[PDB]
Structures are given as C-alpha cells and as structure tokens.
C-alpha cells in the first residue's frame, strides 16, 4: 500500500509468504527475502558496456580462442545479453493498460 510505485501493477499482488515454526540458533526470529526487481538491469547494463569495452579492441581474446573457443560464441552470448536486457526492459515500466499505436505492416495510410 505504501511503496505501490515500486511494484509491477499487472502482477496485482506481487507477494508470496512462507512461515516456519523453527528459528535458527541465536535470536528469537528472522526473515529472508528475494525480489525479482527489474532493477537487475543496473548490473547487466554495466557488464554489457564493460564487455563491449574489451571486445571492441578484442582485448585478451587470444586466451579463449586458444582453448579453441570460437568468437561467434562471444557474439551470441553478448547478443543474448542485449536481448535479455531488452526483456528486463520490456517488463520494466510496462503499463497494465496495453500499448495502442505501434504497427508498421498495415495496408493503408490515408486518414
């Protein structure tokens, strides 16, 4: 209710809970979290820019290629990294309402 702007609205209650009768040894209670925050892009946009740094000069690649790795694996992994950031970005800030105007295959433009 308070932090609503930090939740994805089309998953209308984002929460799973579980509760165990047995604490760990020490203090009387505890809790453990996991978020699928779309914030995750802040890590992966850093690696991809840093990757591209190294690879736009082909820095230390001779090691990898010398174990017989092909350079089009680095190209697909980088592509799959860019496409994964695009999926983080497809569901980040996505409206509960659908997008309307976005077509380009249509047969007519006149009115």
């Amino acid at each position: 209710n308070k932090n609503s702007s930090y939740f994805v609205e089309w998953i209308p209650n984002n929460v799973k809970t579980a509760v165990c009768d047995i604490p760990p040894r020490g203090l009387k209670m505890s809790a453990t979290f996991i978020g699928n925050s779309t914030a995750i892009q802040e890590l992966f946009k850093r690696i991809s820019e840093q990757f591209t740094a190294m690879f736009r000069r082909k820095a230390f690649l001779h090691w990898y290629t010398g174990e017989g790795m092909d350079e089009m694996e680095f190209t697909e992994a980088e592509s799959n990294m860019n496409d994964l950031v695009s999926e983080y970005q497809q569901y980040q800030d996505a409206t509960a309402d659908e997008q309307g105007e976005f077509e380009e295959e249509g047969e007519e433009d006149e009115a």
Partner: protein, 48 residues
C-alpha cells in the same frame, strides 16, 4: 638510418566497423475471446 616509417603489428583491425548495434523485442499479446456467454439463473419462457 631512415627506417621507412615502419607500421604496427598486429592490431584491432577486425573491429574497425564494429559498434555493435542492438536487436528488438515487442511483447505485446493477443486478446482471448469471451463472446460465448449466456446466463442460466432466470427465466426466458415461463416469464410469459
């Protein structure tokens, strides 16, 4: 002693056109059809 302006060996020459660019994603979904509907909890004949 003139060396004839000797060139480097061997550089990032395979990267000279490289950026690289990004692909696209657009998801986006189709509506299901819910037009097969009628209620049963009333009367359509015995009302007459």
């Amino acid at each position: 002693p003139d060396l004839k302006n000797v060139k480097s060996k061997i550089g990032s020459t395979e990267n000279l056109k490289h950026q690289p660019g990004g692909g696209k994603v657009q998801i986006i979904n189709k509506k299901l059809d819910l037009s097969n509907v009628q209620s049963k909890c009333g009367s359509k004949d015995n009302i007459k």
